[PDB]
Design a protein around this ligand. Structure first.
Ligand SMILES: CCCCCCCCCCCCCCCCCC(=O)OC[C@H](COP(=O)([O-])OCC(O)COP(=O)([O-])OC[C@@H](COC(=O)CCCCCCCCCCCCCCCCC)OC(=O)CCCCCCCCCCCCCCCCC)OC(=O)CCCCCCCCCCCCCCCCC
Ligand SMILES: CCCCCCCCCCCCCCCCCC(=O)OC[C@H](COP(=O)([O-])OCC(O)COP(=O)([O-])OC[C@@H](COC(=O)CCCCCCCCCCCCCCCCC)OC(=O)CCCCCCCCCCCCCCCCC)OC(=O)CCCCCCCCCCCCCCCCC
Ligand SMILES: CCCCCCCCCCCCCCCCCC(=O)OC[C@H](COP(=O)([O-])OCC(O)COP(=O)([O-])OC[C@@H](COC(=O)CCCCCCCCCCCCCCCCC)OC(=O)CCCCCCCCCCCCCCCCC)OC(=O)CCCCCCCCCCCCCCCCC
Ligand SMILES: CCCCCCCCCCCCCCCCCC(=O)OC[C@H](COP(=O)([O-])OCC[N+](C)(C)C)OC(=O)CCCCCCCCCCCCCCCCC
Ligand SMILES: CCCCCCCC/C=C\CCCCCCCC(=O)OC[C@H](COP(=O)(O)OCCN)OC(=O)CCCCCCC/C=C\CCCCCCCC
Ligand code: HEC
Ligand code: HEM
Ligand code: HEM
Ligand code: HEM
Ligand code: HEM
Ligand SMILES: COC1=C(OC)C(=O)C(CC=C(C)C)=C(C)C1=O
Lengths: 117, 354, 92, 95, 55, 242, 92, 354
């Protein structure tokens, strides 16, 4: 069923990954443009078809959706994150709280919590 | 605030691929406002002195008072339908995996709603509400002296009503504040789509999503108007129109339909506290269903077989609650509770590698 | 909270005509329901046989225990459903 | 908001205060796109609902058929319980 | 198109008027209060010199 | 055990969406209540003014109320007196307190019939069924003096004597007075008493429901219009079609 | 065919259905031409104050006559069963 | 909101040259919160069906209920004292010349407060309260049928109490919202100083101004505690402890001390509407006292002779209100009103050049 759903959307399995996951985001930073361009077009077509309650024509459905094209970059991203974790986040650091638009409890983006509005 | 409104209503971008199940939330907000307004207006003609006669005086003497009385009762049923359907949706599309903050804010409103409703039916001074608060207050009978502090007497009396009424008046306004915290996280943490990924297909809200959201709300209004004026569905038990007699026990001390899933839990388990505790589990375990997972996936858009069996478990437990405490229903209901735990365990457990 | 559940009139089979109650030899009108009792009892014969069987089983018991209320309530509910479908046609 | 690469802006013009959420949902379009459309005032506005009607309901019922087996097991249990309740009441009472 | 958007406004404004007007109408003295307020007194049967009291 | 037998679904006129309370039946129902039910029950929350211009003309309601004697006061000497009834008085109550009533019905309390048409599962159907549901006791069931069997009362044994007997009253309109008629009529009247605003609720509901349908069609055309812009767009990447 | 499986595909009749695009056909244009001859756009809709006045005045008159119509509908369905339709005869 | 709090409390800079008359506003905010809390808590034990017997049951049966009853009555007196003193200050330093937006926001709260206090008096359900509302409501007796819509009957009854009570419950929460709009303009439009110009002498609020503002509030608390427990000053009329009798008119139908200025205006002018209209003038003309000026000056830190005569006019009118309607007091009071019009014209009029 999963293979059929991917084929109907015209997308690959790795396209389905949500970039709200931080490993996926860090991998998508370093994918080559050729992979990136085709990944966007497939995801765009999938959302159009899903929104309009349509399915990809069968003429275009004869492909293997489980090709792991993101694997090299997922592994690189995990390696980069593990280094940062081990070399820069080995202790619960103390910082001045609610200053510069950040809670001081660790997040790095300003105005990214309710109490930091 | 006009710029805030423009940023959150007029220039707010949402994916164009969302279904009508993404309109449920708009309906909750609108029906919630209606319940506050009608409540404040009813209180203009009734207070806590004697609700039984007060409800009679509203429906018979006040001009168009019947509208206020039946809207406030039926719109509660509606609030709980839309909320419970909003949760079923969020479970199906697993909208708690990456937007847990939104899920947490919602659960807070669910907790508040469960207290607002219970106490409103004692304001009617009816038999089934008198004897249903007398049976739920006696679940905290273990904590020493706490029942007396809450009740204000050794038996439920006008004193108990005068205080719960203030909680019923004020707690809804706080709920509206938590609704802002909820819409705040939704707007920052972008909404989930019918597709698992994120796509550049967003369109402004006022010109498109609000027109569609109104088509939805007007559809529900047609149906709610029919119930409001013709009682097509029995959503209020008739035994709440019997004057309170503290000597005679009602034929059946059951809650309203939207507390029958936690009433059954309490009538099925053999120890009173075990029941209370399994009612905590139901409202608490559902807040950690993605915490122990370890794979880069949101478990979304599969066949959702586990989800279907959970939604049916809820419906089946509500049925057992309507039924009297017959032994055969108790045995079958205990199996349904065991099954819920196993289904919940399946959501919680991470997977080993072949 | 309310006395009845609303329905479309096409779902509410209201009597389309009125047949006056029969008059007795004395001249007093006979209750339409009483006349409908035998006919509706026949329509519920299956439950009536169950009840009649119970009566004979409790009659044998040499102790004083035994009731047939359970089977009577099923027969009565059946006979009454039959009456509801045709009684208001004889009532103004 | 979207990924930090997606929300990174090419222009140096400040983000308007009323468009904060709008620009936190920006995407960096790779390779380009050619988007086209026509005003609804010059189009048929109800036809597509009819054109897509059969396929919409076919693909909906084929997915909802996944729950058939689950549904049947649950109804079998509902019937078993109902009958068990009735026989138990007739056994405890009902001479 | 503008007839359709306008009819949504036409019907909406009627529902709003009706809602607002009926809510304010509920503040009018109630049916029981109106009945007691105005009292018709039957002067038939009084005799000259008699004093009666009406609450 | 099982819950009390469910009342049959009677075809009352007012059950349809566009139907009213049949005033002719409600009038006969008042007569049945006044001459039969009132001996033991009270309708505290039903006032005579509720029937004016709805069930009976104003002068007629005055005559009905004046037939009863109420206890008003105090007078200027601090004493309580008895006066004829008025349009502002509640329906008379047979007993002064619940303890007096209980002492006159073998300990059983005749419930107030103001909201009884909606206080039992089945609603109006429960009143019709109960009044016509007295039967000879089931085999093996023996009832003491003052206890009567009824299929719809919870338990089967009710302390109310069978209240409706053929020829008990004469209807002013000439309708044949049979037990089933009185039942159909007193059930109708008690249903009206519960919610006298039933007809206003249903006439205003009719105008709201029909208007809401027209409203649905307007918002639907609007929704279909604006979303055509979105649902017919064409995004191309290596292609161009005009 | 293939309904209920991973091989599910649109049947031939659903595919023939989607092959009928109706391009160039407009069978409901007569209604729009006729509606445009009422000059509602040039007179009311185009100007915002006049559009507001159409919704207000049209909602005042529409609400009244809608009520009038459904009042007559009710008076007819319930003929003979309304208080006004059955004057009461005082007992002698 | 933590960053908002830090921006408006911790890193908020205020001039170091301000007096203790710049602490009055802090006290209003604190005493206002206390009045809402005590009101909600009193509501837990109060039955608005008879508030005469309800107040007795609070002071005699509820544990420490006397504290709640007397705080809620005395803290009202306190609210009006601090508010009226906050206006006197704003007039003396002419803090409306450049900060009119702050002045407008404050006046809105003053209007709301005038309604809250009056209706709260009627909830006491005593002679004075009943007859007082019966007199005020009959000022809008000209507008046809409006008395009936407000009262709900042909005479004040519990029907009127049940509706005004909702206004008394809800209107205070709205006042708190307008307090935010007020503090918003104050923080944007910087506060005025004891000196007419703007100087670089500002210091943070939490470390300095809040310590001083608390010394002020604790000073007032010492005095308010003495009144709360020993009634050093008569701030509540005794005739509100007399059971209502519609047949007998009280010895004197007067409002609380904080409504005596407008009571006198209405008892002095010979036409009822003229009196109502002169009350409108008092609470409206003071909002345009700098609009017609044309000089580059704020008329600040002069001898303020006109100001002193205005503050005394207020006090003197309150005295005339206490006094019975002796003719002599009416003539003298009419002169005081003529004088007030003249003083207010002096503020309004721009000056010609020699
Ligand atoms: C059994 C079926 C079980 C599965 C149901 C579907 C589940 C699903 O995935 O939907 C979730 C749905 C998402 O669905 P989706 O596939 O993503 O698509 C959504 C739409 O595309 C969104 O589309 P949209 O954006 O356009 O919004 C419109 C949408 C808005 O509504 C929805 O989104 C719909 C949500 C699902 C509703 C499912 C209703 C199923 C009703 C079946 C009725 C059968 C009657 C048989 C009578 C027989 C009489 C003899 O409306 C529809 O799509 C309506 C479609 C048609 C509905 C069904 C019509 C049945 C007609 C039958 C006619 C028979 C005629 C016989 C004539 C014979 C003549 C001789 O949303 C949620 O995840 C939660 C929604 C809230 C409700 C969940 C309820 C779950 C439990 C169902 C229990 C059913 C009863 C108990 C059975 C067991 C007893 C022991
Ligand atoms: C400026 C002057 C203006 C004067 C205005 C006079 C008219 C007026 O207003 O009278 C009202 C008066 C009628 O008042 P009414 O009887 O109260 O109104 C009808 C009912 O209210 C209506 O019945 P109801 O209120 O009992 O019904 C319920 C109501 C309200 O229901 C509710 O509100 C119920 C729910 C309440 C909820 C309460 C709780 C709320 C809680 C919070 C909820 C939050 C949400 O809702 C509705 O009825 C809904 C109606 C929706 C629209 C219906 C029509 C749809 C048309 C569809 C057209 C499109 C499809 C076409 C298809 C075509 C196919 C070929 O108007 C008339 O008698 C009509 C004729 C007026 C003629 C005016 C002529 C003016 C002449 C001026 C001459 C001047 C001469 C000067 C000479 C000297 C010069 C110096
Ligand atoms: C029945 C239901 C009941 C429900 C009850 C519910 C109760 C809920 C209570 C919720 C309380 C939330 C409090 C949030 C405070 C946020 C403060 C803030 O913006 O901190 C930023 C601040 C930024 O960090 P930072 O830069 O290291 O610290 C800068 C500040 O200087 C760090 O502060 P600092 O060292 O300068 O000052 C520390 C402390 C020191 O405070 C004091 O020494 C003054 C204490 C005054 C107490 C009140 C006296 C009232 C007298 C009444 C008399 C009778 C009246 C009748 O003062 C404060 O924290 C500010 C207090 C402002 C009070 C204004 C209103 C007074 C009334 O801290 C944070 O954001 C992290 C902590 C956040 C809160 C956890
Ligand atoms: C249970 C609770 C009670 C239920 C029953 C009562 C429900 C009451 C609900 C009332 C809703 C009232 C909404 C009125 C909206 C009126 C305006 C409107 O939207 O019209 C369309 C119009 C939009 O029209 P437009 O967007 O086509 O604008 C075109 C304008 N011209 C033609 C001039 C170029 O909206 C407005 O007028 C603006 C405000 C919205
Ligand atoms: C969709 C319908 C929802 C329910 C509407 C409703 O309750 O309508 C009331 C009533 C039914 O009354 P009954 O008692 O069943 O009468 C049967 C024949 N005497 O319906 C009607 O009067 C006719 C049906 C509604 C017509 C509405 C027309 C206006 C809306 C058009 C929108 C386009
Ligand atoms: C006139 C036709 C009526 C109607 C419409 C009703 N009654 Fe009676 N009733 C009596 C007593 C003692 C009771 C209580 C008995 C007990 O339940 O043990 C009742 C009860 C009722 C009910 C309520 C049934 C319920 O389940 O509680 C209703 C709806 C009802 N009655 C209707 C006694 C009497 C009389 C005493 C002799 C008379 C006469 C009537 N009832 C007449 C009527
Ligand atoms: C008072 C009841 C609540 C109201 C007012 C409400 C309101 C809304 C609104 C308006 C939306 C955005 C529109 C939508 O996508 O439908 C939404 C989203 C959401 N709500 Fe609620 N909600 C409530 C109850 C709950 C509860 C109890 C939960 C948790 C069990 C919850 C969890 C969520 C989640 C996860 C989302 C995001 C869905 C997605 O990802 O888009 N809500 N809610
Ligand atoms: C989350 C919002 C609310 C819900 C879910 C809720 C629920 C209900 C319920 C279920 C009833 C019982 C109705 C009946 O008797 O059958 C009730 C009664 C009542 N409610 Fe609410 N309510 C809400 C908010 C409010 C508010 C804000 C007020 C106004 C102060 C209010 C005022 C009343 C009053 C006076 C009653 C008693 C009258 C009645 O029985 O209808 N309610 N409420
Ligand atoms: C601007 C804020 C408020 C002021 C100025 C105000 C004023 C007062 C006044 C003057 C009294 C009469 C006291 C007495 O009888 O002598 C009163 C009574 C009362 N108020 Fe308030 N009030 C405020 C807000 C509130 C709030 C928020 C509530 C809670 C819903 C409340 C609840 C009550 C109650 C129950 C009474 C009657 C009991 C009493 O007489 O003490 N008030 N109020
Ligand atoms: C509910 C009553 C009100 C409260 C809570 C309140 C609160 C405050 C606060 C906290 C301040 C800033 C601190 C201060 O300088 O003292 C202030 C300033 C001010 N208020 Fe109010 N106020 C109220 C009533 C009023 C009224 C009725 C007026 C107008 C007649 C008014 C006009 C002003 C003005 C002009 C200022 C600025 C003073 C200066 O320039 O610094 N306030 N108020
Ligand atoms: C009468 O009202 C109610 C009950 O009566 C039995 C409930 O069981 C319940 C459920 C209670 C718990 C402790 C889960 C609620 C909330 C209720 O409203």
């Amino acid at each position: 069923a999963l293979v059929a759903r991917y084929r109907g959307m015209g997308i690959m399995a790795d396209d389905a990954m949500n970039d709200k996951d931080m490993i996926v985001e860090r991998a998508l930073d370093i994918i080559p443009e050729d992979i990136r361009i085709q990944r966007y077009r497939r995801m765009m077509r999938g959302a159009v078809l899903a929104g309009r309650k349509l399915h990809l024509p069968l003429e275009l459905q004869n492909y293997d959706p489980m090709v792991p094209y993101m694997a090299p970059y997922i592994e690189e991203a995990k390696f980069q994150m593990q280094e940062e974790q081990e070399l820069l986040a080995y202790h619960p650091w103390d910082r001045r709280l609610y200053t510069a638009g950040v809670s001081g409890f660790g997040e790095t983006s300003m105005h990214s919590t309710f109490l930091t509005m | 605030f006009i710029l805030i409104i423009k940023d959150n209503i007029i220039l707010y971008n949402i994916n164009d691929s969302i279904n009508y199940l993404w309109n449920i939330g708009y309906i909750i907000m609108v029906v919630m406002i209606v319940q506050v307004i009608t409540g404040i207006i009813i209180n203009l003609y009734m207070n806590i002195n004697n609700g039984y006669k007060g409800i009679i005086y509203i429906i018979k003497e006040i001009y168009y008072g019947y509208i206020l009385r039946y809207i406030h009762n039926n719109n509660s049923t509606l609030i709980y339908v839309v909320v419970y359907l909003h949760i079923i949706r969020n479970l199906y599309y697993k909208t708690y995996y990456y937007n847990i903050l939104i899920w947490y804010s919602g659960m807070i409103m669910l907790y508040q709603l469960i207290i607002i409703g219970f106490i409103g039916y004692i304001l009617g001074w009816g038999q089934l509400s008198y004897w249903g608060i007398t049976v739920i207050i006696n679940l905290i009978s273990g904590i020493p002296y706490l029942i007396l502090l809450i009740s204000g007497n050794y038996y439920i009396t006008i004193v108990t009503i005068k205080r719960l009424y203030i909680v019923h008046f004020i707690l809804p306004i706080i709920l509206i504040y938590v609704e802002i915290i909820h819409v705040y996280y939704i707007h920052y943490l972008i909404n989930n789509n019918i597709v698992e990924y994120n796509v550049n297909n967003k369109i402004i809200f006022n010109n498109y999503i609000l027109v569609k959201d109104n088509n939805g709300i007007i559809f529900i209004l047609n149906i709610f108007i029919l119930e409001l004026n013709n009682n097509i569905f029995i959503i209020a038990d008739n035994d709440n129109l019997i004057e309170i007699n503290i000597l005679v026990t009602p034929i059946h001390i059951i809650p309203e339909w939207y507390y029958l899933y936690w009433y059954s839990i309490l009538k099925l388990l053999p120890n009173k506290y075990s029941g209370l505790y399994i009612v905590v589990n139901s409202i608490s375990i559902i807040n950690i269903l993605s915490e122990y997972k370890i794979v880069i996936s949101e478990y979304k858009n599969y066949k959702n077989i586990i989800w279907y069996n959970q939604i049916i478990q809820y419906i089946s437990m509500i049925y057992i609650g309507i039924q009297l405490p017959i032994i055969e229903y108790i045995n079958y209901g205990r199996y349904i509770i065991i099954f819920n735990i196993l289904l919940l365990i399946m959501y919680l457990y991470p997977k080993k590698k072949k | 909270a309310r006395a009845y559940c609303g329905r479309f009139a096409f779902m509410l089979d209201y009597p389309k005509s009125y047949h006056p109650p029969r008059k007795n030899e004395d001249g007093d009108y006979v209750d339409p329901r009483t006349d409908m009792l035998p006919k509706c009892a026949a329509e519920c014969s299956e439950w009536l046989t169950e009840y009649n069987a119970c009566v004979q089983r409790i009659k044998m018991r040499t102790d004083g225990r035994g009731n047939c209320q359970g089977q009577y309530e099923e027969f009565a509910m059946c006979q009454d459903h039959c009456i509801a479908h045709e009684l208001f046609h004889y009532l103004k | 908001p979207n990924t930090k690469r997606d929300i990174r802006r090419l222009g140096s013009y400040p983000v308007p205060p009323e468009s904060k959420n709008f620009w936190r949902g920006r995407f960096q379009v790779p390779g380009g796109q050619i988007q086209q459309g026509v005003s609804p005032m010059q189009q048929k506005i109800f036809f597509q609902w009819w054109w897509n009607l059969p396929t919409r309901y076919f693909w909906r019922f084929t997915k909802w058929s996944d729950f058939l087996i689950p549904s049947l097991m649950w109804y079998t249990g509902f019937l078993m319980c109902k009958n068990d309740v009735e026989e138990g009441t007739r056994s405890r009472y009902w001479y | 198109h503008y007839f359709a958007t306008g009819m949504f406004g036409l019907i909406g404004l009627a529902f709003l008027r009706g809602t607002v007007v009926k809510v304010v109408h509920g503040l009018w003295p109630a049916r029981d209060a109106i009945a007691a307020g105005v009292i018709e007194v039957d002067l038939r049967g009084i005799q000259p010199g008699q004093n009666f009291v009406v609450k | 055990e099982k819950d009390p037998p469910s009342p049959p679904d009677w075809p009352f006129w007012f059950k349809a969406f566009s139907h009213c309370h049949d005033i002719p039946s409600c009038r006969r129902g008042y007569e049945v209540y006044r001459q039969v039910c009132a001996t033991c029950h009270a309708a505290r929350f039903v006032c005579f003014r509720h029937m004016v211009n709805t069930i009976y003309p104003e002068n007629r309601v005055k005559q009905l109320a004046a037939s009863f004697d109420y206890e008003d006061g105090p007078n200027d000497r601090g004493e309580m007196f008895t006066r004829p009834g008025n349009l502002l008085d509640p329906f008379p109550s047979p007993y002064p307190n619940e303890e007096a009533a209980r002492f006159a019905n073998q300990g059983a309390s005749p419930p107030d019939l103001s909201q009884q048409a909606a206080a039992h599962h089945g609603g109006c159907d429960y009143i019709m069924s109960l009044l016509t549901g007295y039967r000879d006791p089931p085999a093996g069931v023996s009832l003491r003096s003052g206890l009567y069997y009824n299929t719809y009362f919870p338990g089967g044994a009710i302390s109310m004597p069978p209240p409706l007997n053929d020829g008990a009253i004469e209807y002013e309109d000439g309708t044949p007075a049979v037990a089933s008629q009185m039942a159909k009529d007193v059930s109708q009247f008690l249903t009206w008493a519960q919610d006298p605003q039933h007809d206003e609720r249903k006439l205003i509901g009719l105008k709201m429901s029909t208007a809401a349908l027209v409203w649905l069609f307007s918002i639907s055309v609007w929704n279909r219009h604006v979303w055509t812009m979105i649902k017919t767009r064409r995004i191309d990447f290596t292609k161009t079609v005009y | 065919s293939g309904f209920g499986t991973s091989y599910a595909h649109d049947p031939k009749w659903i595919e023939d259905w989607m092959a009928r695009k109706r391009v160039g056909v407009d069978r409901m244009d007569w209604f729009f031409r006729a509606f445009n001859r009422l000059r509602l756009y040039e007179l009311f809709f185009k100007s915002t104050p006049r559009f507001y006045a159409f919704m207000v005045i049209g909602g005042l008159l529409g609400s009244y006559y809608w009520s009038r119509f459904w009042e007559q509908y009710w008076i007819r369905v319930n003929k003979g069963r309304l208080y006004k339709d059955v004057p009461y005869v005082y007992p002698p």
